[PDB]
Amino acid sequence: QCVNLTTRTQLPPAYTNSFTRGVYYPDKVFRSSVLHSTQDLFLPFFSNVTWFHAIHVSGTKRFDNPVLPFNDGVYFASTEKSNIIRGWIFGTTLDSKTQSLLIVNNATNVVIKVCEFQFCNDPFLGVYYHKNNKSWMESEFRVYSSANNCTFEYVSQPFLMDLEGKQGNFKNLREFVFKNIDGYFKIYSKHTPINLVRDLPQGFSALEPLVDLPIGINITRFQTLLALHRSYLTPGDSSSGWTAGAAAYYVGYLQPRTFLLKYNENGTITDAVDCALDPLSETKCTLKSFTVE
Amino acid sequence: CPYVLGRXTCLXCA
Amino acid sequence: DVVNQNAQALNTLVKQLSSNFGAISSVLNDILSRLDPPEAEVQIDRLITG
Amino acid sequence: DVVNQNAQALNTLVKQLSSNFGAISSVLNDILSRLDPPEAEVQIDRLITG
Amino acid sequence: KGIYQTSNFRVQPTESIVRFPNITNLCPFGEVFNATRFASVYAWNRKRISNCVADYSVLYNSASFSTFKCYGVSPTKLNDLCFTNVYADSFVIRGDEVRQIAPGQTGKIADYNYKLPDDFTGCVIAWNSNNLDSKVGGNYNYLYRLFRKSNLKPFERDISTEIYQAGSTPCNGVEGFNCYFPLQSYGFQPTNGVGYQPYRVVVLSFELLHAPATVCGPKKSTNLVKNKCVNFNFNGLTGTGVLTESNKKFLPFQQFGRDIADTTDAVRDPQTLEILDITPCSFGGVSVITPGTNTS
Amino acid sequence: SNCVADYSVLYNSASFSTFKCYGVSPTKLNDLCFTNVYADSFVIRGDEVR
Ligand SMILES: CCCCCCCCCCCCCCCCCC(=O)O
Ligand SMILES: *[C@@H]1O[C@H](CO)[C@@H](O)[C@H](O)[C@H]1NC(C)=O
Ligand SMILES: *[C@@H]1O[C@H](CO)[C@@H](O)[C@H](O)[C@H]1NC(C)=O
Numbered sequence: 001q002c003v004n005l006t007t008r009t010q011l012p013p014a015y016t017n018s019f020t021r022g023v024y025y026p027d028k029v030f031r032s033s034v035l036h037s038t039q040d041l042f043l044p045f046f047s048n049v050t051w052f053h054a055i056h057v058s059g060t061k062r063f064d065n066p067v068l069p070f071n072d073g074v075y076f077a078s079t080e081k082s083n084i085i086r087g088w089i090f091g092t093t094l095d096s097k098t099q100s101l102l103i104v105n106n107a108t109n110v111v112i113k114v115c116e117f118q119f120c121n122d123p124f125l126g127v128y129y130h131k132n133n134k135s136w137m138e139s140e141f142r143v144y145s146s147a148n149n150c151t152f153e154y155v156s157q158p159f160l161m162d163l164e165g166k167q168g169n170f171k172n173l174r175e176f177v178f179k180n181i182d183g184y185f186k187i188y189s190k191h192t193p194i195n196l197v198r199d200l201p202q203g204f205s206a207l208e209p210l211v212d213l214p215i216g217i218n219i220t221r222f223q224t225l226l227a228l229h230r231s232y233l234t235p236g237d238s239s240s241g242w243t244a245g246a247a248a249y250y251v252g253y254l255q256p257r258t259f260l261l262k263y264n265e266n267g268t269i270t271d272a273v274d275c276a277l278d279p280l281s282e283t284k285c286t287l288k289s290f291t292v293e
Numbered sequence: 294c295p296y297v298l299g300r301x302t303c304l305x306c307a
Numbered sequence: 308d309v310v311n312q313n314a315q316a317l318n319t320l321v322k323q324l325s326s327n328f329g330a331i332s333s334v335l336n337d338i339l340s341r342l343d344p345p346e347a348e349v350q351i352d353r354l355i356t357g
Numbered sequence: 358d359v360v361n362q363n364a365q366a367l368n369t370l371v372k373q374l375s376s377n378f379g380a381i382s383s384v385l386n387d388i389l390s391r392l393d394p395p396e397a398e399v400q401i402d403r404l405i406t407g
Numbered sequence: 408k409g410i411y412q413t414s415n416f417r418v419q420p421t422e423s424i425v426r427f428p429n430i431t432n433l434c435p436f437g438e439v440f441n442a443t444r445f446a447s448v449y450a451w452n453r454k455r456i457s458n459c460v461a462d463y464s465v466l467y468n469s470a471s472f473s474t475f476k477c478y479g480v481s482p483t484k485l486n487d488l489c490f491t492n493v494y495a496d497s498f499v500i501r502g503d504e505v506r507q508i509a510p511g512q513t514g515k516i517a518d519y520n521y522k523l524p525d526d527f528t529g530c531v532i533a534w535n536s537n538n539l540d541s542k543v544g545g546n547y548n549y550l551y552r553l554f555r556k557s558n559l560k561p562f563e564r565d566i567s568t569e570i571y572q573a574g575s576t577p578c579n580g581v582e583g584f585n586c587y588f589p590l591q592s593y594g595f596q597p598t599n600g601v602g603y604q605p606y607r608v609v610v611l612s613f614e615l616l617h618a619p620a621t622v623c624g625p626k627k628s629t630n631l632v633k634n635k636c637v638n639f640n641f642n643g644l645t646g647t648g649v650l651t652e653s654n655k656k657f658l659p660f661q662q663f664g665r666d667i668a669d670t671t672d673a674v675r676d677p678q679t680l681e682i683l684d685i686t687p688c689s690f691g692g693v694s695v696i697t698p699g700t701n702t703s
Numbered sequence: 704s705n706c707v708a709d710y711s712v713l714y715n716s717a718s719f720s721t722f723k724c725y726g727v728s729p730t731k732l733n734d735l736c737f738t739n740v741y742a743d744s745f746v747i748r749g750d751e752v753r
């Protein structure tokens with residue numbers, strides 16, 4: 001059932017730099033040792049991306065799951081150590097009057113559904129820590145109150161998913177590009193092992209294509225689903241007796257841009273030029289070379 | 294008829 | 308004569324934008340405001356080639 | 358500069374085989390394996406002109 | 408007398424090669440074109456088709472299609488190709504609204520119910536179904552969206568039932584004067600004239616010769632020969648050249664490889680997943696020296 | 704003359720069997736203005752509709 005969370009500490013939003021991220025494979029065609037120019041919905045180089053935290057200093061307490069616009073596609077970056085970001089919510093009004101897309105990982109399966117969900121104001125998943133067994137077990141799944149008259153459903157193969165709330169450094173970076181073109185929800189993704197404390201790291205990673213879902217719906221807003229922690233160390237009711245594991249995620253927006261990608265000898269995209277960034281990069285794209293005399 | 298004439302999905306009836 | 312030849316070449320290049328080149332019009336925006344992108348694309352391709 | 362200009366001209370001539378010239382594709386074999394001889398004649402005529 | 412250039416040295420192909428994936432099942436023509444029930448046009452049904460052979464000649468006993476129009480591909484090539492991801496959109500419309508299942512069309516169905524993209528690759532199939540979807544008292548189970556505030560985007564499905572404000576007074580979620588339910592019933596009767604009779608529409612959408620393909624036509628694959636100039640047919644992509652072993656490492660979502668001229672010079676063989684390099688057989692210029700045809 | 708060409712009000716009661724526009728795409732018909740509009744109405748048989 002829908003639980004409105006409390007004990008949130010209000011801070012101003014944070015912003016960071018995207019550097020040279022968000023580049024994905026534009027097609028499914030092998031090229032090697034080439035410099036290929038293409039125009040697509042890309043995240044521009046050195047973009048002002050929005051930064052959202054999940055932290056319990058205890059002493060600010062941030063659990064950021066706002067409703068953001070979708071625009072022409074979304075770049076999503078998640079720096080995590082222990083499995084906090086579980087999926088997303090896509091739609092227009094996010095109630096029973098319209099059709100919406102749920103992508104979720106409920107620690108056993110990956111559920112992709114397209115239905116008229118009556119979404120909660122504060123949707124989240126939950127892990128409970130048991131002192132008497134030293135185990136982290138999934139307890140709560142409060143995303144929607146109803147799901148009626150609906151078309152697309154997918155449940156993946158079962159798996160056992162690690163839910164221990166580890167401490168230290170952010171160990172995994174997961175980057176996604178979401179597009180909604182001609183009734184197709186295109187998801188591009190890449191995972192990278194990292195070791196850092198905060199902020200979005202600089203570097204290049206080419207997002208290989210993950211899936212295309214024929215959902216056929218209208219999408220203007222989206223919302224990330226996070227998982228909180230409850231234990232004997234966090235007493236109270238359902239609204240207040242909770243804590244947040246540390247995670248960060250970063251949101252950027254794609255626009256139609258012309259990029260110059262570099263395929264090396266193995267066929268992997270290793271570098272890119274954003275031709276509309278500065279006149280130096282426009283000269284780089286005109287020269288079809290990364291080096292300017 | 295699922296609805297009367299003029300109502301529901303039978304607005305354009307008669 | 309050199310100055311006149313260069314100015315005449317530039318003015319001919321400007322005046323050649325009024326040709327149709329076998330398309331239905333010479334204005335890009337008049338083609339784009341009367342045709343959907345499939346039927347517009349043929350006329351835009353004719354203007355591009357010309 | 359002479360060697361560089363000649364090699365650049367030949368490489369530009371090779372690289373211009375990737376253009377569509379208003380046709381549906383740049384590969385002859387992809388056009389020929391998806392169309393009958395009439396519409397393939399149209400697309401190959403566009404490629405031949407380019 | 409002199410020396411004259413001629414045509415370059417060309418080598419002709421020796422045999423023909425067809426390489427298609429190992430697929431044995433036939434495509435569900437009975438489940439798609441002979442289903443017991445069809446969806447409404449506002450809630451049109453999309454079905455994914457994979458791992459089968461598109462032998463549409465088995466439709467020839469029981470199809471009788473009145474409309475069959477393909478857009479990105481000639482019909483006579485349909486037996487020689489492979490299709491990557493195939494979707495079948497099934498619905499029922501009026502006879503007069505079949506012409507609205509073309510791209511770049513306006514009308515009630517094309518704006519509020521079902522829209523095709525401007526770059527549409529696939530085939531629209533429509534046939535009369537007055538003997539199935541019509542009854543004597545009138546069949547009113549097929550609905551269409553009559554009222555909407557904006558046109559649909561391509562391949563977008565709207566199943567909302569919000570009350571449409573047709574005038575200036577707000578509806579407040581209830582119907583009445585100038586406040587109408589957006590879905591309306593088709594009136595299907597056997598005595599209706601043609602154009603007021605039900606028509607079943609199946610729209611097949613696919614993408615050709617750029618991705619790995621899984622649905623393929625009724626072509627028998629041959630043996631894979633190498634180191635010789637042959638005519639090849641890899642997953643519907645034809646051509647001529649010499650096929651050799653390659654050290655290219657294809658990513659799992661890739662099927663073809665292209666060079667700087669954007670011609671296909673690498674391919675993954677669909678039966679045995681090995682990377683082959685395609686190299687054209689014609690190579691090398693030829694000149695001829697003569698002392699004159701008059702002299703000798 | 705002097706009216707708004709809102710043809711969506713025809714969606715209630717028309718059910719046209721032939722609708723073919725020649726100098727203009729149908730999807731552009733909501734975005735344009737028309738100068739010298741004439742309607743020629745008559746009755747034929749079906750085989751002469753082509
Ligand atoms: C069951 C759906 C299979 C879809 C296969 C992918 C598309 C390949 C082409 C199929 C053509 C559809 C049937 C055409 C029948 C034409 C017969 C006629 O003209 O009377
Ligand atoms: C949660 O908050 C929203 C908006 O403030 C409200 O509409 C809803 O009724 C609340 N739900 C509960 C269970 O308090
Ligand atoms: C996760 O979701 C799937 C699909 O609804 C369900 O079968 C499974 O039991 C769920 N697992 C948990 C732990 O809730």
Ligand SMILES: *[C@@H]1O[C@H](CO)[C@@H](O)[C@H](O)[C@H]1NC(C)=O
Binds near residue numbers: 093
């Ligand atoms: C999509 O949703 C937005 C907001 O609800 C709406 O303004 C827009 O018209 C919708 N798009 C279509 C094609 O209906």
Ligand SMILES: *Cc1nc(C*)nc(C*)n1
Binds near residue numbers: 295545547
């Ligand atoms: C029986 C019936 N039903 C509908 C929806 N409409 C008419 C005219 N009649």
